[PDB]
Amino acid sequence: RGKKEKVILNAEQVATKTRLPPIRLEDRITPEPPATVARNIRSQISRAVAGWKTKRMFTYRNKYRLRRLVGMTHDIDSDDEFAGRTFVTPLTKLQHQAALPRSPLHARFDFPHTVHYDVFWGPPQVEEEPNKSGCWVSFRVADLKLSDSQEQRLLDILGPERYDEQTGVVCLEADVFPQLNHNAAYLGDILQQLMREVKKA
Amino acid sequence: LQVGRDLFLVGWVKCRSRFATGHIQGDVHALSYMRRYLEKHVDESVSSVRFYEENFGMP
Amino acid sequence: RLSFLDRFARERIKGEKARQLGAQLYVKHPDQKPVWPDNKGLLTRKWPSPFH
């Protein structure tokens, strides 16, 4: 273990030396702007087309062709479609079309049901308990007391996973948001929409 | 061992089929409780008990 | 800090570089230092280094 040889920089080396240090990981911490993202994507595509290709690329392209043929892609027809930018999102539509009670004395469901949610309590803690934001509603189709067509529509819409045949029970879950109140509101809205769709039967 | 863990006593014990010995150290109240337990609260045949080398006021 | 202060008081530090660095780092008590975390990262390179 000895000292590394010292090299006296030449005048040429000092004159042709970078005036700024190279980009570090500490600098990379700053996110890439969308302009750089797009430029990198364009450069990679151009290089790959230019000839830095691979067999995996061909296989991936064939798989994408199969997906497009089965129609599970975002490609646009040249004649059917080619020959809006602002839209109402599905959750906003659900909220807007939802009907809410005027007062706690008014019920907008009219059928038996049970609402379940989980809450966590304990000594002081710095980390929030995971898996405590979902809520669900359970009810019996017989209690709902619908016609045969409406019951079949309900079962088909909810699928076999949400239907327990042993006791004729059906459950609907909502764990789409990390907040229990938001999950409960979404659950109520979707339950109302489900009942409307069942009545459409 | 359970009694000593509860009472925060220290030292050592040694139990066998017919005898037992030990050297116990700790607070005066804890020592008195241990003495009472050994004299009256042992679930085995205790024909004789003896205490010796008692010292107090240790730093 | 305590170890270096003891060794410096007993004059057990030989290297002048070590003496200077340890004196600059440990002589002034944290409460008296104008900036407690006077430096971070490498010892001889100051914290906001754009090169390290």
Partner: protein, 112 residues
């Protein structure tokens, strides 16, 4: 060895205050870079999947999840690290023997 000149019994280092480790500092830098650039990589992958091309993403080589390693929190070693502890063998041993795990259900009287 039966040391010929035994030294004093040294007090162990603090549990929560590890010594400087530039490798750990760079690991933290990589972790934060991945946290910041996670969305951009998702955008890259979305664009490539929509275009149906299996192209590389070089910037992930530097700001990706796979540049991060599980390093000992108390020792700085980058091997033999479990998520349930985040510490290496000696860090875990010191923590257990200092009595910080009795509250958290650790049972030293259990072998298996």
């Amino acid at each position: 060895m039966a040391a010929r000149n035994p030294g004093p019994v040294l007090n162990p280092p603090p549990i929560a205050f590890p010594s400087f480790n530039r490798r750990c500092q760079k690991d933290w830098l990589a972790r934060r870079a991945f946290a910041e650039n996670e969305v951009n990589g998702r955008i890259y992958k979305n664009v490539y999947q929509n275009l149906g091309f299996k192209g590389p993403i070089p910037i992930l080589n530097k700001v990706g999840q796979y540049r991060i390693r599980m390093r000992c929190i108390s020792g700085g070693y980058s091997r033999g690290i479990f998520r349930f502890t985040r510490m290496a063998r000696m860090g875990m041993l010191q923590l257990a023997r200092e009595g910080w795990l009795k509250k958290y259900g650790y049972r030293p009287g259990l072998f298996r």
